[PDB]
Amino acid sequence: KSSCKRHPLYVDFSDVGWNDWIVAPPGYHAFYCHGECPFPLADHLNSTNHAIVQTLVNSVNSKIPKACCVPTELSAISMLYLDENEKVVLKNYQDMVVEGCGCR
Amino acid sequence: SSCKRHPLYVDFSDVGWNDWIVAPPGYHAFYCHGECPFPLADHLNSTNHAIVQTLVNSVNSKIPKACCVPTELSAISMLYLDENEKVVLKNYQDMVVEGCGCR
Amino acid sequence: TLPFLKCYCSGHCPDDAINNTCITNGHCFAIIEEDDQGETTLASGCMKYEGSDFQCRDTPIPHQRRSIECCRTNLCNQYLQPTLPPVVIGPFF
Amino acid sequence: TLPFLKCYCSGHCPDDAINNTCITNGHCFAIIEEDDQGETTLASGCMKYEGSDFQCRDTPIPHQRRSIECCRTNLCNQYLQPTLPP
């Protein structure tokens, strides 16, 4: 059973059928987070006091879930999409790309 | 059911931290748990990434759903003994779940 | 930006919802979908404005049939009557 | 504060570990734990300073027997070898 880390994911807008409202780009690397949050949580997993405390509670009381591997740093990407009015606008989309993961 | 916060009291004797932490005896930690369905409602505080990953999951289940995790936390003070056995007051961040979301 | 919109909710109500209404700065929505048993179900609620292009639009072919619709005037999701996409025949897609 | 300590790792290595070492601002560690088939495994690595006291101190009766030890000198967790709680 492998540990919480970042993984590749390329989102292709034509494959999910958004190529009709997103003029650019054609897709992007979004990545994703997945993997076990064991005990102890090692330095590179950027846990929080709470996730750490709850990983301990988990092992006495399994009815309490383990912390979860999620994105801990995200970044933006600009896109060109459609208007209600049929007009392309350009907007910077926040938190689109996973830059790092952690057990939270 | 869907992502939300749940009660969770951590008793420091139950974890045996009962002999390095002088106060408090325990605290309400709470925890986050539950489904991150499509669509993600307002009160789940999702990121664009998680909204996007939810949609990809519905199309390719080899890609996980977003996860229900704490999106706001708060601190608590604890009095405790250290290596050098000093009974010190220290404030501890990110100890209590104030709200949950799908990330 | 502050929530200015009031919506009906059903199934996706926040845990502190009063009378099955919720408030938002994005859209009200209504969705029709089959569960994993193939039984059809109806829900509604509030959708925050960030990421709403992705959600209101949806993907055309998820695992289970669905149709989500969105609007932006108070309680407007009471007039939304979405319709399950037609079924595909053939051992492929 | 910056990482300043170098530790050995095993089982809990970061993907970018250098010759099975990691760096941290907290502690080196080693842990021994027994499965439910009676067998035992050894793991080691780096623990960040924040939250380290919860982690380095040894709770009683988890769903299993485990013992973890920590230290703060360079590669010190090469010398650690915890022993299961009687």
CATH code at C9?
2.10.60.10
| Residues of chain B neighbouring A8 (CB-CB closer than 8 A) | none
Q: Are D71 and D27 in contact (CB under 8 A)?
A: yes
Gap between the Cα atoms of C76 and C28, Å rounded? 7
Residues in D lying within 8 Å of B, measured between beta carbons: 50, 53-54, 57-60
Q: To what resolution in angstroms was this structure determined?
A: 2.4
Top-level CATH class of A1-104? mainly beta
Question: Could you tell me the residue range of the domain that residue D80 belongs to?
Answer: 1-86
Q: What is the dihedral of CA A84, A30, A98, A3, to 10 degrees?
A: 140
CA of B94 vs chain C CAs: smallest distance (Å): 23
C12 alpha-carbon distance from chain centroid: 9
Q: Angle A52-D81-A58 (CA atoms, 0-180°, nearest 5)? A: 25
Q: Which residues contact A53 (CB under 8 A, 6 or more apart)?
A: B10, B29, B95, D51, D54
- For the domain B1-103, what is the CATH superfamily, name and number? Cystine-knot cytokines (2.10.90.10)
Would you kindly state where each structural domain of chain B is located, as residue ranges? Answer: 1-103
| Residues of chain D neighbouring B80 (CB-CB closer than 8 A) | 53
| Residues of chain B neighbouring D60 (CB-CB closer than 8 A) | 16
Nearest to C84 by CA among C47, C35, C48, C37: C35
Gap between the Cα atoms of C13 and A95, Å rounded? 25
For the residues of chain A, what is the DSSP string, one character each?
--BSEEE--EEETTTTT-TTTEEE-SEEE--EEE-B--SS--GGG---HHHHHHHHHHHH-TTSPPP-EEEEEEEEEEEEE--TTS--EEEEEEEEEEEEEEE-
Helix (H, G, I), strand (E, B) or coil at C93: coil
On the 0-12 / 13-18 / 19+ scale of CB atoms within 10 A, B82 is exposed
Nearest to B78 by CA among B22, B13, B18, B29: B22
On the 0-12 / 13-18 / 19+ scale of CB atoms within 10 A, B20 is middle
| Residues of chain D neighbouring B17 (CB-CB closer than 8 A) | 54, 57, 59
Helix (H, G, I), strand (E, B) or coil at D54: helix
Nearest-Cα residue of chain B relative to residue D61: B15
| Residues of chain A neighbouring C53 (CB-CB closer than 8 A) | 21, 81
Q: Are A98 and A5 in contact (CB under 8 A)?
A: no
Gap between the Cα atoms of D5 and D77, Å rounded? 11
H/E stretch holding D32 reads strand D27-34
* Ordered alpha helix ranges (H), C1-93: 52-57
C78 phi/psi in degrees, rounded to 5: -75, -20
Gap between the Cα atoms of C8 and C92, Å rounded? 38
Gap between the Cα atoms of D46 and D61, Å rounded? 24
CA of A42 vs chain C CAs: smallest distance (Å): 33
Q: Are A59 and D63 in contact (CB under 8 A)?
A: yes
Long-range CB pairs of B77-85, under 8 A, 24+ apart, other chains included = B78/B21, B78/B23, B78/B24, B79/B21, B79/B22, B79/B23, B80/B20, B80/B21, B80/B22, B80/D53, B81/B20, B81/B21, B81/B22
Gap between the Cα atoms of A37 and A21, Å rounded? 38
Assigned token pair, D79: 């010398």
User: Are there at least 3 beta-carbon pairs closer than 8 Å between D and C?
Assistant: no
Contact A60 D62 (CB under 8 A): yes
Q: Which residues contact D46 (CB under 8 A, 6 or more apart)?
A: A42, A43, A44, D5, D7, D9, D12, D14, D22, D23, D24, D26, D27, D28, D29
C15 phi/psi in degrees, rounded to 5: -65, -10
Method of elucidation: X-ray
Contact B41 C22 (CB under 8 A): yes
Contact C12 B58 (CB under 8 A): no
Nearest to C47 among B2, B39, B48 (CB): B39
Number of domains in chain C: 1
Q: Are A14 and A24 in contact (CB under 8 A)?
A: no
| Residues of chain D neighbouring A59 (CB-CB closer than 8 A) | 59, 62-64
Q: Are B48 and B22 in contact (CB under 8 A)?
A: no
Residues in B lying within 8 Å of A, measured between beta carbons: 8, 10, 14-15, 29, 31, 33, 47-50, 52-53, 55-56, 59, 63-64, 66-70, 73, 92-97, 103
Q: How many residues in total does chain A contain?
A: 104
Contact D51 A5 (CB under 8 A): no
- Counting one residue from chain A and one from chain B, the pairs whose CB atoms sit within 8 A come to 77
Helix (H, G, I), strand (E, B) or coil at D6: strand
Assigned token pair, C72: 């932006």
